[model samples]
Target: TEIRVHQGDLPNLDNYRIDAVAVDTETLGLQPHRDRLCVVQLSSGDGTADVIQIAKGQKSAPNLVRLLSDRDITKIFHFGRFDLAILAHTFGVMPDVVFCTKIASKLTRTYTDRHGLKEICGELLNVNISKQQQSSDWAAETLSRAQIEYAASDVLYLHRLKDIFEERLKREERESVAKACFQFLPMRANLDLLGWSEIDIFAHS
Candidate 1:
């Protein structure tokens, strides 16, 4: 589908019909994340780069976690484990299906290990990205135009990024491998027997 992103909250916003919420978790606090989130939605990918904002928050805010659940959609991310952690912890439901290119890169043990999203974009798609405010305040209420642009760049390219990796997994006969990785994300948080069972579940324990 041709992509589009909406900022702030609105009525009947569920009109987008549901694909997935592509969000980024920042090391910085709320403002940087909020500001960058808007940027993520505004930027577009040219088979090179783009950004996507995960719909989040309450009815007044738009919870991306709830958005995924209400829609019954499969969530997709490049290296979304930590991001999923935020969702599972905050929202109570991690995506049933997730696609991650970072793990795909690791699965093959990519030679140089430059494994960054931007670097991977350049390597896989030959598109040089603009990353001026990558280290900005993502939780800001008033995001700078530059930071918005940067955030948009963050997720706008992800959908396309998923596509490239999908093809690679097919070519390498690794689709099953990808499926296994998706199954790994939501179960990571429980530091108990549950987590241990997942690791050795297939075994005759």
Candidate 2:
């Protein structure tokens, strides 16, 4: 279930367009990345189309936290690390219920090591998403037609992905792996220790 929203339909889309996206998809896939904060309400569908975007606002790490740790809500991401870090910094809270498809694929040891979300979806869920506009200007508000479609699709199949992973974990009885992953978030994370020099040392290790 994916929700699709268009700027034409979005009444207040500007607020959600973050000026400083911590992780833009371009540039060695790191640093000063531009990401948009959009919301997609879940619904039932054939897993091909049918996504409705509910509300979109530029969200900070604090804003993203509100969506995390909801009771019984399993947050799904393809490989949501930088996004998660941004959220953690902004929210001052980190939810422990994160599910990443990359990790799941790693655990299952899928033959193809394709880590990109679209590739994984195509392989695992048979969905082909467009990447042509993936690197587009996410900071653009009143999004272009292509941009709207791209943003909407980002979260549309999250529920579907969760279904597959949850089933596998439940079947394998290795749910503890997820628990351990969630344990990684540093609540009220120490800001000073994040320095590159300190992180490189084995003192913490």
Candidate 3:
């Protein structure tokens, strides 16, 4: 699957079975509450990117929901909290066994504060993907080829990033703590859904 697109619902995920997958969402804008989730991009780290162009009111996507809700398969993201939040709010399913490269980079790459996907991908994998289509209109009736490719690029390198981060976490002696953070990601997404995205309850005021 080089760049397959699904219109309304996801095809049977058995066609792309893997223990972990790179998952990302394309929304109209940054705010999950205001911006509608327009696309869900996935990859098995096999040099294939599958794009799902979610239709309006497609809340009953059983196949996608089942995979996301499954605890056995891990889902990888760059910024896990934001994507998890938008995905859960849009699909009514919060994916489990998550990994966030941003968090991992923050944990292991202590020399700098640059944890963005583009920067990390360049540094770790030497792959440069353009974010030009990132701010484009995702809620449109049809998407351009550039938009599709841009969406696909977002999920393609996540698996590799996760791999690099895993070893780094072990080398830095923070693997266990990172695992704990991964487990807590889903609940953190729920907090965003509940309107606490900007407020940290863990903070002492």
Using TM-score as the measure, the top candidate is 3
Per-residue lDDT, model 3, residue 105, is: 92
lDDT of 1 at 107: 61
The models' CA-based lDDT, in order, is 0.54, 0.48, 0.87
Assess candidate 1 and give its lDDT: 0.54
The digit string of per-residue lDDT tens for model 2 on 1-205 reads 3334432132332333322111111111233123333323222223432222223343332233343534344555556554455445333445455567667766654566676778777876898999887665544434577665665566666667667777877787778886575445232123322534135333666
Per-residue accuracy of model 3 over 75-188 as CA lDDT, tens digit each: 898888999998888878888789999889999999988878899988888989788888888888889999999999999889888888989998889988999998898899
Candidate ranking under TM-score, highest first, comes to 3, 1, 2
TM-score of 3: 0.96
Q: Better model by TM-score, 1 or 2?
A: 1
TM per prediction = 0.68, 0.62, 0.96
What overall lDDT, based on C-alpha atoms, would model 3 receive against the true structure?
A: 0.87
Could you give candidate 1's per-residue lDDT for residues 1-205 as a string of tens digits? 2334344432333443546445454434332223223323421233222233333442233444345555355555656755555445444565566666678777653577688888888887787877667676655555666665565556656667677777778888888877887787556533221344236445575
